[PDB]
Amino acid sequence: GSSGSSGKVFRALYTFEPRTPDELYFEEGDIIYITDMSDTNWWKGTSKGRTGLIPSNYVAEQSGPSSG
């Protein structure tokens, strides 16, 4: 089968504007999968049926311990 879900989940704090065709365009509040973090400046993940580079400034390690 398939067990063990790898990859981090980063959220887009705001809409980003990719200048290069390699980057990935996302909108404020968009789940992203950051598996490759070799470049602290430029990351590589997939959000909307797409896979491109993502800025490590617009997104942030999802953090929100909810209880209710």
**What number of residues does the chain have?**
68
The CA distance from 17 to 23, in Å, is: 9
Those residues with Cβ within 8 angstroms of residue 46's Cβ, 6 or more apart along the chain or in another chain:
24, 32, 33, 52
Check if the beta carbon of residue 31 is closer than 8 Å to that of residue 9: yes
Check if CATH label 3.20.20.370 holds for domain 1-68.
no
The CA distance from 68 to 38, in Å, is: 36
Domain borders along the chain are 1-68
Method: NMR
The sign of the dihedral angle between the CA atoms of 45, 49, 27, 67 is negative
